[PDB]
Recover the amino acids of this structure.
């Protein structure tokens, strides 16, 4: 069974998609945190509070609750 | 992860905005959990259809399933272009 451990391998096509969407997520997260706090106001400083704020206020960001606590 | 994510965050926010050393740290950590979570999930979905490996469609389905469906459009075109360059050299 040591030739069947090499089962469920990750393909190149998958490494690709995984990397592409993690970048999309980073941009989504950064941008959502900012819009949600300053709307369309420019030149602002995104602090930690904003990120925990978007994690609090967003259901799809629910899984980040333990990794992005209320207080740093 | 520390370098390429800073460029991702600068690229997403207004060219005049800023992110504290603290916020960027969280974002990076989040990007990590995101990825583990999506793989974890895509892996799950792949077994619910009981097939051996994770397809690009399983990941595409897990994303729409995790409420990140706004992602799927771009990712499919990305996937289209990828499949093309591969079928050449």
């Amino acid at each position: 069974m040591k030739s069947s451990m090499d089962t469920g391998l990750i393909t190149n096509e998958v490494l690709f998609l995984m990397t592409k969407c993690t970048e999309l997520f980073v941009r989504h997260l950064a941008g959502a945190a900012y819009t949600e706090e300053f709307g369309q106001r420019p030149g602002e400083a995104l602090k930690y509070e904003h990120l925990s704020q978007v994690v609090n206020k967003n259901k799809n960001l629910e899984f980040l609750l333990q990794i992005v606590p209320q207080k740093i | 992860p520390n370098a390429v994510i800073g460029r991702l965050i600068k690229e997403a926010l207004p060219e005049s905005a800023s992110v504290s050393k603290e916020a960027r740290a969280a974002i990076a950590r989040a990007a990590s959990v995101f990825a583990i979570f999506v793989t974890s999930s895509s892996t799950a979905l792949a077994h619910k259809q009981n097939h051996k490996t994770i397809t690009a469609k399983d990941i595409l389905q897990t994303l729409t399933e995790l409420d990140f469906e706004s992602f799927v459009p771009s990712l499919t075109q990305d996937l289209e272009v990828y499949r093309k360059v591969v079928k050449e050299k």
Observations:
- Chain A touches chain B at residues 7-14, 16-18, 20-31, 33-34, 38, 42-48, 50-52, 55, 59-60, 63-64, 67-68, 72 (CB under 8 Å).
- The first strand of chain A starts at residue 45 and ends at 46.
- Residues 11 and 28 of chain A are 25 Å apart (CA to CA).
- Strands of chain A lie at 45-46.
